[PDB]
Paper text:
Most pathogenic Gram-negative bacteria transport haem across the plasma membrane using an ATP-dependent active transport system, the ATP-binding cassette (ABC) transporter system. Here we describe the structures of the type II haem importer system (BhuUV-T) from the Gram-negative pathogen Burkholderia cenocepacia. BhuUV-T is a close orthologue of HmuUV-T910, which is a complex of BhuU (TMD), BhuV (NBD) and BhuT (PBP).
The crystal structures of BhuUV-T and BhuUV were determined in the nucleotide-free form at 3.2 and 2.8 Å resolution, respectively. The structure of the BhuUV-T complex revealed that BhuT interacts with the periplasmic surface of BhuU. Most of the space in the cleft of the BhuUV-T complex is occupied by the two H5a helices of the BhuU dimer, and only a very small space is left between BhuT and BhuUV. The structure suggests that the release of haem from the BhuT cleft is facilitated on formation of the BhuUV-T complex and that haem cannot bind into this cleft from the outside of the complex. The structure of BhuUV-T in the haem- and nucleotide-free form was a symmetric dimer containing the inward-facing conformation of BhuU. On the basis of the crystal structure of BhuUV-T determined in this study, the periplasmic gate is tightly sealed by the R204-D200 salt bridges and hydrophobic interaction (L203–L203′) in H5a.
Residue numbers in the entry:
A (entry chain D): 1 to 10, 13 to 55, 59 to 113, 119 to 166, 174 to 263, 267 to 273
B (entry chain T): 41 to 305
C (entry chain B), D (entry chain A): 22 to 133, 141 to 359
E (entry chain C): 1 to 55, 59 to 113, 117 to 167, 174 to 263, 267 to 273
C-alpha cells in the first residue's frame, strides 16, 4: 500500500509522528485547517520531498512494499499521480495535447491515443477535444486536468493523490467529480487520498477520513466514526453540531 | 606651457625648434604623438578624441594647439572655460592643410621665422616628392588600384573610401584608390573587394600587427582571389608616418611611392 | 479520433522548400554580378580555366551556409529556451553567453591577437560566463527560474562594465572594429570556420531534439512535469548546456545577432502550435530562412558595403513586434 | 497602535547628511595638487588663488551639482516608474525616452552640427520617442500595462537600428563620440547647461511628489485603486509626462546612465518601506549620494583619465544585484 | 438604495447579464447564488459602476444607488459611498498591515491622519487582525491576508459620527471557523451602520445562514429572490445549480444532495 509510518518532516516541524496508510479501492479524505500539514502530507506521499528535494524527513513512506526514496521519478509516475489544486496552461496547447501528456510516463502508439479520449468522456470533457486551453473556464480547465491525470493511471494498484481538486468548481461538478473518483477508485484497484475543503463533502464521498490537528493525525476511520462534534471542535477550533439524513451533515451550533 | 593635441601638430611644433625654446615649452600631448622621440616623452592626457579638463589643466597649459579631431566638444569647452587659449586647426588632406599647420603653429607659438624655415624646406622637398613619383608610375602602367585597410572586425576589414587620409596618400603616390563610391571608413565586403580588384594592399604597421601579420592579411576572406592576393602584394607602414599629414609629408609620400614600386617590380 | 493541427507538415515542408529556394537565390546574387561558366571546372571539370571557384565556392557558399547555420541555431535555441522558462520572450542569451562572447572577443582585440584565436576568445568567453551564471544561480543541485535571470543580469552588468572600460582605453582601430562585431556580421565567412562551428551547433541541436518530449511536459507546469517523472533539474541542465554551446559557437563568428530567437519560434507558434515536436524543426527552418533573407540584404541593399545584418534583423523584429501589438488590445 | 513609519526620518535625515558631506569631498578633489587652504583662499580671498577660483566655480561646482541632479532625478523617477508598474524592476527608460535621446543625439553628430543645439537634439529626440510609445500603446483612451512595454521595446528595436545604421556610416570621430557618449559622462558640465536642465527635473519632481498619495493606492491593485476613486488613467499620463520630462532632460547631457534607477529606490525600499511618501525623497537622496560617489571615483581613480561613469555605476549594481540574489535564493 | 432596474450587459459575442433588476437596502445582507460565470462577478462589477465609471462593453437599463444613477457619480465620490472586497492577491511590495489598512482611508483626504488613523486600528480589531499591525503582508497566510483586506475595506466605510459594501466571494480560502466569523461581523457591520451588503458566496448553505436576502442567478437573469426560507428550495436550486437537492431542518435549514 501507500503507507507512511511515524512520518516526520520539517523552519519548524510541520508534520510529526504521522502514521497513516492508503490502500487500493478506498477513498481517504484529509480533513484539517490551512497550513497544518495537509498539503505537506500529500507532497510527502507524492515523493516530492524524498528523491532530491532543504528539508529533512524521517521514518518512511512505503509505496506497495517499497520505500518512496528508492523509486525513480519516472517509475513513480507510472505508480502514482497527483492533481495539484489548479494551474493554467501558459501555452495554447489543445485539450488532446494536454490530456495526451498523461501518457508521458508510458513510452515504448495509438493506445495512448485511445486512453486519452476515453478519459475525457469519463471526466466529462470530450466536447473540448479541439479547443485552446487559454480560452477555458475554471471548470473546463479542471475537467481537462482530471482527464489528463486519469489518462496517466489506467493500466488496462495505482495511487491517485488529490490536492483540493473540486475547489472553484460549481456545485454540480464537485459532486460529479467525487462520484467519478469513487467509481474510478472502485473499478480499478486504485487508491485515492484527497484533500477537501468542505467536511460535509468528505463525509459524503470518502470511505476513510483522516483529521489533521496539531501537526499529527488526531482521528481516523469511516465518516460516521470521525465526523463527531468533539473531533471537529479540536481539529477545526469551531463549534459543530451533528444532524442526520435519510449520511451525516454538520452545522455550527 | 603649451599642450598639443594631434600627432602631426606635435611634429610641427617640435619641427619649429625642439621641446623648449626661449618662447615656449611643450608640456603634454595625446597618445597619437609617437614621433619623434621628444613628443613620446611628453606626458599624455588620453587619446585625442576623449579628454578630461582637470587632467588637461593638470599639465598646466597656457595654450592648447588642438587638431580638427580634438574632442569631445564638452571637454574642449571645459578647457576653454578654464581660460586657456585653444587654437584649432583644419584638415584638408592636401599641401594647403599641412602648410596652415606649419605656419599656424609658428604663429601661435610666436616663432614666425622658424616657421618660414620649416615651410621652405617642406615645400622644396615636397616639389621633389611630386617629381620623384612623376618620374615613374609604380608598376610601369596606368595608376594602380590600391586598397587601404585601416583595421579588421574579426574577419571583416575596414577600408578607406574617399574623404580619408588614405585616399589622399594613395593618390599622391601615383596610384588610384581601389575603393570608389563612398566617403570615410566602412567595413569591406568581399563584394567590394572583388569589384575593387586591388593590385596592392596597403596597411599600417599597427593594422598589420593587429590582424596577425602578412599571411593573416592575405587569408582574409576574398583576399586570396584578387590580383594583390594572387601576387601576395602587401605594404605596411607606420600609421602616424603614413597618414598624419604633417611636416614629414614629402618623405612619407616618397616612401609610400617606393614601397608600392618595389611591390610591383 | 482526430482532431489536430494537420497543417503542421505543410508549414514545415513549405518552410523547407523556401529555405532551399531562398538559398539558391542567395547563390544567384549579388555585387560583382558574376557568370558561373568556369565554376564547373572549378568545382570539378568544365572547359573554362579556374575563375568563379574564386568567389562562388570560397566566398559566397560559406556565407549562405553560415546564414543557415546561424538562423537555424538562434531559432532552435530560442525554441528550447522559451519552452524552458515557459515564457515566449526568453531569448537564448539569458545564459550570459552573448555577453560572455562579447567580452571574450573584445578582450582579445584589446590585449595582444592574430586570427582564428578571436573565435575561440569569443567561444571560450561565451562558455565561461554561462557556467559563471549557472554556478551562481544553482544551489547544488536544483537551481530556480527567477534566480538564473537574477545571477544572469548581475553578471551581465559585470561583463558589460569590463567592456565599457575596454572600449575607453581602446584606440581607434579598436573602437570601430569593436562596435561592428557587436552588431554582428557574416562578412567574414569561410569554409573551415563553419567546419569549426558546425560540429558544435549540429551537436547542440541533437542534444536538444532528444529532450523535446520532456520539454512538452514542462509547459503545463514544472511541478506536474515532476509528477510525470521528468527530471526537471537534469532537463534544465541539458537544455542550458546545449544552447550555451550552439549559441556560444554561433556568436563566436557571427557576432551579436538579435530578434531571431524571439521572432522565428513565435511565428511558427501562431501558425500551428506550441508542440515542441514541431516547433524545433520549424523554428530552425524559419529562422534560417529569415537570416539568409536578411543577410542577402546586408550584402546588397547598399553596395559595396555590408550593413551589419544586426541592423537588418533589428529591422525585421520591430514590425513583428509592432504586429503582435495590434493582435493584442481587446477590452 | 501602530506603527513603523518612524525609523524613516532617521534614514532620510542620515541620507540628507551623507549627501551633503559627500558633496564637500566631491568639491574637495581635483587633479591631485590642490589643498583646502588655497581652495578656501580662492573662493573667499585675494586674487592669488584666482586660477583655483575659476575651477572650483566653473569646472567642479557644475560637475558636482549635475551629479546630484542626475542622481536625484534618476532615483526619483525610478521610484515612480516602479510604483506605477507595481514591479520594482521598471527603469525610467521603458517609455523609450533613453533610446530616443540616444538617437536624437546621434542623429545630430551626423547632421548639417554644433553646439548647445545638441542637448536639444537629445532632449527633443528623447521626448518624441516617448510620445510615440504612448501613442501606439494608448487606446484612446485606457492604455494597459503590458502593451506599453510591448510598444516601448517594439520601438527600441527601431531606434537601436537607426543607431546601428548611423554608427556604421559614421567616420572615426563620429564613432568615438557615440560610444563614450552612450556610456555617459559629466565631463561636459558647465553652469549654463544645468541652468537649462534643472528647471525640468525640478519641475518633473514637483508633479510627481504631488501624485504620491495616489501612487500608494496603486500598489495594492489597479482595480481597487479604481474603487478608491484614483483616476488610474490620468495618473498614468501624469507620471509618464513628468518622468519623460525629467529623464529626457537628464540623459541629454549626462548620456545614458543606468542602475541608479534600479538600485537607489530599492535600497531605500528595503531600509524602510514601499510607502511612496517616504520612497520618493529617500530615493533622490540616495540616488544622488551614489552617483556623486560613482562619478568622483571616475574623476580620480585613473586621473588624468576620465572614466565614463556608465562604467562605474555598473560596477555598483553588480555587487548589489548579487547581494539581492544572495538574499532571495530560496526561492 | 442601490437599485439596478432592467439591467442588461454584454461583452461580444453575446449578452452575459440580461434584463436584471436587483435592489440592495441598507441594513440587509443579500447573498448572490447561482452557477459559476452566470454573471455574478459581472453583476457585482456593475453595482460598483466599474463598467460605467470609465470617463468597450454594452450596458442598458439603470442602476441607481441612493437616488442617483451610477453614471453621474464621480469615482472619488463613489469611493466614499461604496467599497469592494475582491478576493485579492498578495501585494507586490512589503507594505505593513497598517499601511495597507490605512489605504482604506484614501477616498477621505485633503496627509489625512489622525482621526483616519484611529479608525484604521478599530477596523483591524473588529476584523480580527489586531495582533498583526506590524507584520509584512507578504509574509502572511491567505487567511491573515484576507482579514487585513477585510480590515482595509471596513476602515474605508467607518462612519463614527447609507453605504454599500460589495463582497466578491469574501470567505473563500478561509477556514470554517473563519468563514462564519467573517459573515457574522459582516452582518453586525450591516446592522449597526445602516450599511448595505452584496456578497457572492459559494456555499448555498452559508447564504441561508448569513443572508437576510438571497438572489439566485441562473441563465444570466435573476430566477429567484427573497428570504432564505423562500428561496432555498429543491426546485430553485435544481434549476439554478443543475443539481438534485433536498432541504433539511434544524432546531434555519441546510441543503443535502440526492
Amino acid at each position: 500500500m501507500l503507507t507512511a509510518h511515524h512520518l516526520d518532516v520539517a523552519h519548524g516541524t510541520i508534520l510529526r509522528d504521522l502514521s497513516l496508510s492508503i490502500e487500493p479501492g478506498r477513498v481517504t479524505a484529509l480533513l484539517g485547517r490551512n497550513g497544518a500539514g495537509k498539503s505537506t502530507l500529500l507532497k510527502t506521499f507524492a515523493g516530492e520531498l524524498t528523491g532530491s528535494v532543504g528539508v529533512r524527513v524521517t521514518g518512511d513512506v512505503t509505496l506497495n512494499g517499497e520505500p518512496l526514496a528508492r523509486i525513480d521519478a519516472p517509475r513513480l509516475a507510472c505508480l502514482r499521480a497527483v492533481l495539484p489544486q489548479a494551474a493554467q496552461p501558459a501555452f495554447p496547447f489543445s485539450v488532446d495535447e494536454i490530456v495526451l501528456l498523461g501518457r508521458y510516463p508510458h513510452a515504448r502508439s495509438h493506445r495512448d491515443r485511445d486512453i486519452a479520449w476515453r478519459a475525457l468522456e469519463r471526466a466529462g470533457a470530450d466536447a473540448l477535444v479541439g479547443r485552446d486551453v487559454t480560452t477555458l473556464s475554471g471548470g473546463e480547465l479542471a475537467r481537462v486536468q482530471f482527464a489528463r491525470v486519469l489518462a496517466q493511471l489506467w493500466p488496462d494498484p495505482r495511487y491517485l493523490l488529490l490536492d483540493e481538486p473540486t475547489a472553484a468548481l460549481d456545485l454540480a461538478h464537485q459532486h460529479r467529480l467525487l462520484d467519478t473518483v469513487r467509481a474510478v477508485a472502485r473499478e480499478w484497484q486504485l487508491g485515492v487520498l484527497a484533500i477537501v475543503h468542505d467536511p460535509n463533502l468528505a463525509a459524503r464521498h470518502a470511505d476513510a477520513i483522516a483529521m489533521l490537528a496539531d501537526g499529527t493525525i488526531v482521528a481516523h476511520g469511516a465518516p460516521r466514526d470521525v465526523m463527531t462534534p468533539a473531533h471537529i471542535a479540536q481539529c477545526y477550533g469551531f463549534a459543530v453540531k451533528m444532524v442526520e439524513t435519510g449520511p451525516p451533515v454538520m452545522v455550527p451550533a | 606651457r603649451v599642450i598639443v593635441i594631434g600627432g602631426a601638430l606635435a611634429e610641427t611644433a617640435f619641427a619649429l625648434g625642439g621641446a623648449e625654446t626661449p618662447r615656449y615649452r611643450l608640456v603634454g600631448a595625446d597618445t597619437t604623438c609617437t614621433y619623434p622621440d621628444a613628443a613620446k616623452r611628453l606626458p599624455k592626457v588620453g587619446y585625442q578624441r576623449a579628454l578630461s579638463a582637470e587632467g588637461l589643466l593638470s599639465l598646466r597649459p597656457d595654450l592648447v594647439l588642438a587638431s580638427a579631431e580634438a574632442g569631445p566638444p564638452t571637454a574642449i569647452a571645459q578647457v576653454k572655460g578654464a581660460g586657456v587659449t585653444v587654437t584649432t586647426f583644419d584638415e584638408r588632406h592636401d599641401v594647403e592643410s599641412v602648410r596652415a599647420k606649419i605656419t599656424g603653429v609658428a604663429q601661435a607659438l610666436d616663432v614666425r621665422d622658424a616657421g618660414a624655415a620649416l615651410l621652405q624646406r617642406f615645400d622644396r622637398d615636397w616639389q621633389a616628392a611630386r617629381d620623384a613619383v612623376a618620374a615613374r608610375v609604380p608598376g610601369g602602367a596606368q595608376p594602380p588600384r590600391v586598397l587601404f585597410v585601416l583595421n579588421h572586425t574579426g574577419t571583416q576589414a575596414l577600408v578607406a573610401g574617399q574623404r580619408t587620409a588614405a585616399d589622399a596618400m594613395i593618390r599622391y603616390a601615383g596610384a588610384r584608390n581601389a575603393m570608389q563610391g563612398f566617403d570615410h571608413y566602412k567595413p569591406l565586403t568581399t563584394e567590394a573587394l572583388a569589384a575593387a580588384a586591388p593590385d596592392v594592399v596597403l596597411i599600417s604597421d599597427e593594422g598589420l600587427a593587429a590582424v596577425g601579420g602578412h599571411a593573416a592579411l592575405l587569408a582574409t576572406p576574398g583576399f586570396g582571389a584578387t590580383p594583390a592576393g594572387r601576387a601576395r602584394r602587401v605594404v605596411s607602414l607606420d600609421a602616424l608616418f603614413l597618414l598624419g599629414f604633417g611636416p614629414r609629408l614629402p618623405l612619407a609620400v616618397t616612401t609610400l611611392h617606393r614601397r608600392l614600386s618595389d611591390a610591383l617590380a | 479520433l482526430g482532431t489536430s493541427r494537420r497543417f503542421a507538415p505543410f508549414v514545415l515542408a513549405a518552410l523547407a522548400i523556401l529555405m532551399g529556394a531562398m538559398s539558391v537565390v542567395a547563390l544567384c546574387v549579388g555585387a560583382y554580378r558574376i557568370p558561373l561558366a568556369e565554376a564547373w571546372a572549378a568545382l570539378s571539370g568544365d572547359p573554362a580555366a579556374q575563375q568563379a571557384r574564386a568567389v562562388l565556392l570560397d566566398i559566397r557558399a560559406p556565407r549562405v551556409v553560415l546564414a543557415l547555420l546561424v538562423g537555424g541555431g538562434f531559432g532552435a535555441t530560442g525554441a528550447a529556451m522559451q519552452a524552458l522558462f515557459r515564457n515566449p520572450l526568453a531569448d537564448p542569451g539569458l545564459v550570459g553567453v552573448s555577453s560572455g562572447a562579447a567580452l571574450g572577443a573584445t578582450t582579445l582585440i584589446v590585449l595582444g591577437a592574430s586570427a582564428a584565436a578571436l573565435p575561440v576568445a569569443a567561444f571560450a568567453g561565451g562558455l565561461a560566463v554561462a557556467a559563471l551564471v549557472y554556478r551562481l544561480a544553482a544551489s547544488r543541485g536544483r537551481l530556480a527560474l527567477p534566480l538564473l535571470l537574477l545571477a544572469g543580469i548581475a553578471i551581465n552588468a559585470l561583463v558589460g562594465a569590463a567592456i565599457g572600460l575596454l572600449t575607453f582605453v581602446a584606440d581607434d582601430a579598436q573602437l570601430r572594429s569593436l562596435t561592428f562585431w557587436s552588431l554582428g556580421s557574416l562578412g567574414g565567412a569561410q569554409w573551415p570556420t563553419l567546419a569549426a562551428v558546425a560540429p558544435c551547433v549540429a551537436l547542440g541541436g541533437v542534444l536538444l531534439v532528444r529532450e523535446r518530449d520532456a520539454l512538452n511536459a514542462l509547459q503545463l507546469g514544472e511541478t506536474e512535469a515532476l509528477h510525470l517523472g521528468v527530471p526537471v533539474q537534469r532537463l534544465k541542465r541539458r537544455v542550458l548546456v546545449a544552447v550555451a554551446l550552439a549559441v556560444g559557437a554561433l556568436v563566436s563568428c557571427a557576432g551579436i545577432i538579435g530578434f531571431i530567437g524571439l521572432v522565428a519560434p513565435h511565428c511558427v507558434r501562431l501558425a500551428c502550435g506550441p508542440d515542441q515536436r514541431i516547433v524545433l524543426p520549424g523554428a530552425a527552418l524559419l529562422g534560417a530562412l529569415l537570416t539568409l533573407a536578411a543577410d542577402l540584404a546586408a550584402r546588397t541593399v547598399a553596395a559595396p558595403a555590408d550593413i551589419p545584418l544586426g541592423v537588418l534583423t533589428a529591422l525585421l523584429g520591430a514590425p513583428f513586434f509592432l504586429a503582435l501589438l495590434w493582435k493584442n488590445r481587446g477590452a
